[PDB]
Paper text:
In canonical translation termination, a protein release factor binds to the aminoacyl site (A-site) of the ribosome and catalyzes the release of the nascent peptide in the ribosomal peptidyl site (P-site). In these proteins, the GGQ motif required for the catalytic activity of peptide release is universally conserved. Notably, the glutamine in the GGQ motif is invariably methylated post-translationally at the N5 position. Taken together, the post-translational modification helps to stabilize the glutamine conformation in the PTC of the ribosome, and orients the carbonyl oxygen of the glutamine to coordinate a water nucleophile in the hydrolysis reaction.
Author numbering:
A (entry chain N): 74 to 90
B (entry chain v): 234 to 296
C (entry chain D): 118 to 164
D (entry chain X): 9 to 18
E (entry chain C): 211 to 257
RNA sequence: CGCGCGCAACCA
RNA sequence: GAACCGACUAAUGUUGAAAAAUUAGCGGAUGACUUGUGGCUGGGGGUGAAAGGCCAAUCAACUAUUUAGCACACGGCGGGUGCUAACGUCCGUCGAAGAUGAAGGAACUAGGCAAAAUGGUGAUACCAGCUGGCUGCAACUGUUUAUUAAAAACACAGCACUGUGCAAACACGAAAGUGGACGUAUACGGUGUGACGCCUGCCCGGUGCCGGCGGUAAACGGCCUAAGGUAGCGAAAUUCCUUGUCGGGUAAGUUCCGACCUGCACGAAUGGCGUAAUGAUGGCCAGGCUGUCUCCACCCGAGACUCAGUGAAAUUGAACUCGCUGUGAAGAUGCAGUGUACCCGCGGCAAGACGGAAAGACCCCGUGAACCUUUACUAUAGCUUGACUGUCUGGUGGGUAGUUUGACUGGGGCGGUCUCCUCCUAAAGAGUAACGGAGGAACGGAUAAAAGGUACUCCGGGGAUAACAGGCUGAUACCGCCCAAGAGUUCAUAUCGACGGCGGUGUUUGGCACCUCGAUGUCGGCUCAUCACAUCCUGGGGCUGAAGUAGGUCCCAAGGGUAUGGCUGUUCGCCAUUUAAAGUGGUACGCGAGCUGGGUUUAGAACGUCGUGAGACAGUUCGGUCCCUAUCUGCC
């Protein structure tokens, strides 16, 4: 699981790979 | 497509309407060296999106 | 006592074009905070 | 997007 | 024909919103029904 | 890639 | 073209000679001129050829909490989130690398800014048009933001709609009354448009308005629907993509001109398209001219400098006021380590003293403030309706007023959320957070009753909280290296090298919010640089898929060197022509108490667009004040 690039810290957990 | 075949150049967006955009290297360009063809994108304000967009554009051009 | 343009062959700033009170001056002499000093043996006016 | 903010207590 | 007596006539839309009901806008805006400078409907409205 | 192909995508 | 009136450019001046001037130029100069004296108009008021202009240097007059300003911080261990990143955030618990050690003649520049030149009559001094070509916009002369905006903005003649029958409509007036107008529909008011020429298409469903369900768009508007954009025009003041494509122009042209039409998002009186003349109007090209520049040199005066007289000012915790590297509330004269340095002037320069000048204007915050806004709410003047000018009464009523417009939020906005239930997070009692992971059924209720805009803004605060730079971090980025499937005729490793792996750098885009909101000025250009080496050239090597020539690649090497132009504000890039090469980076993306101000980032204005509107737009377009006499360090 990774957060998308240039995205701030909050607003839920990222997406899986 | 092979990623080494082309290169990616980043630079500053024209018409820099503020202290942030004055500095940031959000504007992008891909040169596909053997074909010689060029594409660029400064539509977005994040560099990452821009790069992707211009890559797509490049691909389209190649096609 | 020679100025930078005579002594060190410094390029004069624009003789016109808005340039104010700054025609034959040495321009900048250093950087910013980092060195925070003028380096020794800087090319300046005198003799 | 976040759609998980809910929780009860006991 | 300013000799005749009549001074210049500033259009409401040219004015600021504080001056005339038509006044105000960035560029040329007029999303108002045409009224006198005292807010009375100008086209059609009888007396 | 947000919200409904459309809209939004901002302030320095 | 003088006086006079103005105020487009310029340099100076910016503790001035001046609380907006100076010299040089510049516009109008028989008029919509200018001026003297006196009078009138008064503050939500005037006045305004309209800029929110001007009205005496003054002018938009744990829990609960509409609650988050009981902010915690780090280290350990158990976690969530993040990248098993962060001096991050939210809970529980006590191999091998880095940055201080004359001739030329626009080649200038954003731009020929400034100069130079032209100059008279039919010219020796002073005096005294630069000219021409293409084009946008506005017809024109005028007016405008006194003091950063003179314009494409306003006005304008003209055109149209509409009201108005005279005790006129309308306006100022609690009223009388006055203006309109001593006028009377060929007149007057309001609204839009804006000379002139050719014109001005369709839609009445919506919101108005008019008539009594109809009508009306030169009403506000729009072009399966109310109708689907007509003529004209079209990458345009509008075209994002885009520096569109082609042509012209040029050695080279992001600009310009002509076409094309793919009109993101032209379009017909919030006029469309032409348009002679006019413009301190915008863009482009040419001739002339020139120190604009190549690249400055000399001279003449005024300061600067020395003496004599007088004699300020901002600033200032105290100073016995060095460099570096580190450290540190995270960029050090003061701390550690270290190097260097006799004491003291003067003339200079301006890199630092997050220098001085303004309790930041940007951002957020405040149950601040103002104005403006509208179909936000509540009123209300006025207008209108009736019942008995008055009282009551319905309607209408941003004309005017008082207000309103939530919080959470890895700054705010936008999106999402707000109450209750179940699970996990939760670390074997209970509890236990996050815009954590999964699911289900403004919820301690500010009022009975409430949207917005502000770049015209304002105040109080905040580095509690953003944009710049620093810091931590290194996902991304860049630079290596490992493995070797293959490509390379054959042959992995001359050159490449997939699928994967491991680093380094701080170097892009980021994350964080630690530094500063009692101001740390922002891109680019210029002037000055300085350091790194991951070296572009020159130097020395190895290997070569190295005959030579010429290369490719790798190692060593930072001593020196490392382009002028066209286009664009640009960095970048493209092109032209060079060059031995036209290095890549750090240095507050070096350098504004050194310069510029073209871009951006106020107030004017316009277009496209969105909004009913005020206004707004990481859309565009024209215009738009850059202060500081140096105490200390530093340096000459
Ligand atoms: Mg400086
Ligand atoms: Mg106006
Ligand atoms: Mg009003
Ligand atoms: Mg205004
Ligand atoms: Mg005044
Ligand atoms: Mg509290
Ligand atoms: Mg707390
Ligand atoms: Mg912390
Ligand atoms: Mg040049
Ligand atoms: Mg240019
Ligand atoms: Mg000139
Ligand atoms: Mg002259
Ligand atoms: Mg044009
Ligand atoms: Mg004036
Ligand atoms: Mg002014
Ligand atoms: Mg002016
Ligand atoms: Mg019409
Ligand atoms: Mg054209
Ligand atoms: Mg119309
Ligand atoms: Mg004129
Ligand atoms: Mg000469
Ligand atoms: Mg703090
Ligand atoms: Mg130091
Ligand atoms: Mg230090
Ligand atoms: Mg200061
Ligand atoms: Mg403050
Ligand atoms: Mg809030
Ligand atoms: Mg438990
Ligand atoms: Mg902070
Ligand atoms: Mg914190
Ligand atoms: Mg700066
Ligand atoms: Mg080396
Ligand atoms: Mg500017
Ligand atoms: Mg404006």
């Amino acid at each position: 699981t990774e957060k998308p690039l240039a995205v701030r810290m909050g607003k839920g957990k990222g997406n899986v790979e | 497509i092979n990623p080494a075949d082309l290169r990616i150049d980043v630079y500053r967006t024209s018409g820099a309407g503020g202290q942030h955009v004055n500095r940031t290297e959000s504007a992008v360009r891909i040169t596909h060296i053997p074909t010689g063809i060029v594409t660029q994108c400064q539509n977005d304000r994040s560099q990452h999106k821009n790069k992707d967009q211009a890559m797509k554009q490049m691909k389209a051009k190649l096609y | 006592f020679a100025g930078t343009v005579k002594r060190w062959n410094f390029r004069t700033q624009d003789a016109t074009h808005g340039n104010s009170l700054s025609h034959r001056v040495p321009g900048s002499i250093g950087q910013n905070q980092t060195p925070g000093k003028v380096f020794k043996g800087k090319k300046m006016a005198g003799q | 997007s976040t759609r998980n903010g809910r929780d009860s207590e006991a | 024909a300013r000799w005749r007596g009549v001074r210049p006539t500033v259009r409401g839309t040219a004015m600021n919103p504080v001056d005339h009901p038509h006044g105000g806008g960035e560029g040329r805006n007029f999303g108002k029904h045409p009224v006198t400078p005292w807010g009375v409907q100008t086209k059609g409205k009888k007396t």
